[PDB]
C-alpha cells in the first residue's frame, strides 16, 4: 500500500519505480474581466514523472490547447495525467517499464489504476511523504521549456545531473528533496543561495550548479537554515 518514512529505502532498490506528481499539470492565472467578474487563463503545465533511483525525469509538457472546450478542468487534469503516464509506460520497452508507480496525491490513484488496467502487475501506490515536487517549476531550465512549448512535448532530464558519479541515490534524492523544499518555502532566498557565487556555474547539460563535495555541504546547510527560519516565521515559534 502507501509509501512512508518506514519503507523509505525501497525507493533506491533495483525494482524500477516512478513517482508521478500532477500538481503542475493544470496551471491558471486568476484575473478580473472588463465587467468585474473573475476568469482564469490556463498556462502551460507539466507532468513530473521521476525515477528516484536513476534521476531520469520524463517531463511531459501540457500545452494550454489540451484544455480548449473542456469542462471540469481540475478533474480532467487527473485523467490527462493518467493517460500520459499510461502512454509513457506503453512507449518503454518491457524491461524498462516500472514495477510500481507512486502518485504524490491520492486523487491520482483511481485515474491511474483505470488507465493502467492493461498492466495488472504494475502496483499503483499512494505515499504518506509530503514531497515538494510542486516546486519543479522553480528549476529555471524546467520552467523555460514548459513556458516556451507551442505544442505537446516530452523532454527527458536527469534531475540529479552527474551527482550519482559521487553519491548514492538515497543521498541524491535527499539533496533533491532539500533543494525543492527550500525553493517551495522561499523561492527567492533558495535561488539566491544557489547562484550567489558567480564562479560556480550550471553546465549547459545540467539543471543545478557544479558544486564540489565541500560546496554542496555548505549549500545543503544554507537550505536547512532557510527551511527552519521560514518555519519559525510561519508558526511564531
Amino acid at each position: 500500500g502507501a509509501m512512508n518514512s518506514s519503507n523509505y529505502a525501497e525507493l533506491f532498490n533495483n525494482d524500477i519505480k516512478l513517482f508521478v506528481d500532477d500538481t503542475n499539470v493544470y496551471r491558471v492565472t486568476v484575473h478580473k474581466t472588463f465587467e468585474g467578474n473573475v476568469a482564469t487563463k490556463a498556462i502551460n503545465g507539466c507532468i513530473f514523472t521521476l525515477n528516484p533511483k536513476t534521476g531520469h525525469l520524463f517531463l511531459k509538457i501540457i500545452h494550454t490547447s489540451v484544455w480548449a472546450g473542456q469542462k471540469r478542468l481540475s478533474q480532467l487534469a487527473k485523467w490527462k495525467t493518467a493517460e500520459e503516464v499510461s502512454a509513457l509506460v506503453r512507449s518503454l520497452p518491457k524491461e524498462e517499464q516500472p514495477k510500481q508507480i507512486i502518485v504524490t496525491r491520492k486523487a491520482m490513484l483511481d485515474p491511474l489504476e483505470v488507465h493502467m488496467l492493461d498492466f495488472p502487475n504494475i502496483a499503483i501506490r499512494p505515499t504518506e511523504l509530503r514531497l515538494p515536487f510542486s516546486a519543479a517549476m522553480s528549476i529555471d531550465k524546467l520552467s523555460d521549456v514548459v513556458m516556451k512549448a507551442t505544442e505537446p512535448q516530452m523532454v527527458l532530464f536527469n534531475i540529479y545531473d552527474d551527482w550519482l558519479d559521487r553519491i548514492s541515490s538515497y543521498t541524491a534524492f535527499s539533496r533533491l528533496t532539500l533543494l525543492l523544499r527550500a525553493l517551495k518555502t522561499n523561492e527567492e532566498s533558495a535561488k539566491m543561495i544557489l547562484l550567489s557565487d558567480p564562479t560556480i556555474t550550471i553546465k549547459s547539460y545540467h539543471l543545478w550548479p557544479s558544486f564540489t563535495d565541500e560546496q554542496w555541504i555548505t549549500i545543503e546547510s544554507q537550505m536547512r537554515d532557510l527551511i527552519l527560519t521560514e518555519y519559525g516565521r510561519k508558526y511564531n515559534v
Binding site: W79, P111, V114, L117
Partner: protein, 300 residues
C-alpha cells in the same frame, strides 16, 4: 394454495417463511406450512435455538414439485426434499391438515410486500446463481461466498452472482477511461443489460435475490452484490425512465422491509449517500429517498 409438510421438528428452531417467522420447540408436534401463495418464489429458513449462527434455507416454487422438510440428525439440519409420489404427498398433507398440525402462511389480503420484494425473481434464475441441478429448490446460508469473493474457495457451494467490477476491462472501454469510469451508462446498458442480463427484468431479479439473501441469511457477499447493482444504475447518466421508476419501487419495499436494528450492517453508507445525493440519479428515486430519510437519517 400449496403446502410444505415437515416430517417432524426434533430440534428447537426459529422457522422463517418469506418475511414471517415462528418459534418451534424441541419435539413440538409441528407438521409444516399451508396456504402458501402460488405465483411467487418462496424461501423457508431456519435458525437453531442452540446455534444463532448459520441461518440457512431453501428457495422454492410449489408449481415445480411437491416439497417437504425433514430433519437430518447426521448433517444436523432441516433439509428440503422432493416427494415424487403425488398420492403419498396429497395423503400426508391431508392428514396433517385434518389434525391441524400446520401453521398457515399469514398473508394479510391488502399486503403486496412479498410480491413487491420478488416481482422479478424467477426460480430458473435462482438455480443458475445457486448451482445444484439435481434439486428443483436452492439452498443458501450465512457463510456461502460469491464467485467474486472467491477470486479476491469451494465453487460447488458458491453464489454465482454476475461479477460487477467498476475498475475492470469489462467496465472500461480503451480510450474511454474517464468517460466510462465517471458515467457507467456503457457498462450498464451495453455490457450488462444488452450483453449479460438480456433485459432489465433479469437484472432486477438478481438485485432482489441478492437483497433477500443479505436480509434473511446475513450473507455478506449478497449485500455487496445488491449494493453494486444499485450503484451501477445510480452511476449511469443514461438509464431508461421505466428502469428508474421501477428501481425506486424495488428499493422502497426493500428499505421498508429491513429490520430497523440491522440497518448498521446491511446498508453501505458510501453507496446510499452517493446514490441519493451525488449520483446522476440523485433526483430519480423519490420514494426511496423519502423512506431512507424518515427511517435511517443517521446513516445519511
Amino acid at each position: 394454495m400449496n403446502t410444505v409438510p415437515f416430517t417432524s421438528a426434533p430440534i428447537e428452531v426459529t422457522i422463517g417463511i418469506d418475511q414471517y417467522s415462528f418459534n418451534v420447540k424441541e419435539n413440538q408436534p409441528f407438521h409444516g406450512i399451508k396456504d402458501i401463495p402460488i405465483g411467487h418464489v418462496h424461501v423457508i429458513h431456519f435458525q437453531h435455538a442452540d446455534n444463532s449462527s448459520m441461518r440457512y434455507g431453501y428457495w422454492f416454487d410449489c408449481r415445480m414439485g411437491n416439497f417437504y422438510i425433514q430433519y437430518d440428525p447426521k448433517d444436523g439440519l432441516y433439509k428440503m426434499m422432493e416427494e415424487r409420489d403425488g398420492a403419498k404427498f396429497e395423503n400426508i398433507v391431508h392428514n396433517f391438515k385434518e389434525r391441524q398440525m400446520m401453521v398457515s402462511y399469514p398473508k394479510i389480503d391488502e399486503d403486496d410486500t412479498w410480491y413487491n420484494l420478488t416481482e422479478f425473481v424467477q426460480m430458473d434464475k435462482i438455480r443458475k446463481i445457486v448451482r445444484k441441478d439435481e434439486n428443483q429448490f436452492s439452498y443458501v446460508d450465512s457463510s456461502m461466498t460469491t464467485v467474486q469473493e472467491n477470486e479476491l474457495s469451494d465453487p460447488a457451494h458458491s453464489l454465482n452472482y454476475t461479477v460487477i467490477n467498476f475498475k475492470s476491462r469489462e467496465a472500461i472501454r480503451p480510450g474511454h477511461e474517464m468517460e466510462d469510469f465517471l458515467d457507467k451508462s456503457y457498462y450498464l446498458n451495453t455490457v450488462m443489460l444488452q450483453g449479460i442480463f438480456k433485459n432489465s427484468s433479469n437484472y432486477f431479479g438478481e438485485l432482489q435475490f441478492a437483497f433477500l439473501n443479505a436480509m434473511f441469511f446475513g450473507n455478506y457477499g449478497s449485500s455487496l452484490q445488491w449494493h453494486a447493482m444499485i450503484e451501477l444504475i445510480c452511476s449511469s447518466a443514461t438509464v431508461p425512465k421505466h428502469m428508474l421508476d421501477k428501481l425506486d419501487e424495488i428499493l422502497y419495499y426493500q428499505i421498508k422491509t429491513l429490520p430497523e436494528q440491522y440497518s448498521d450492517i446491511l446498508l453501505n453508507e458510501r453507496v446510499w449517500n452517493i446514490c441519493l445525493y451525488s449520483s446522476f440519479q440523485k433526483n430519480s428515486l423519490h420514494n426511496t429517498e423519502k423512506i431512507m430519510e424518515n427511517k435511517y437519517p443517521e446513516l445519511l
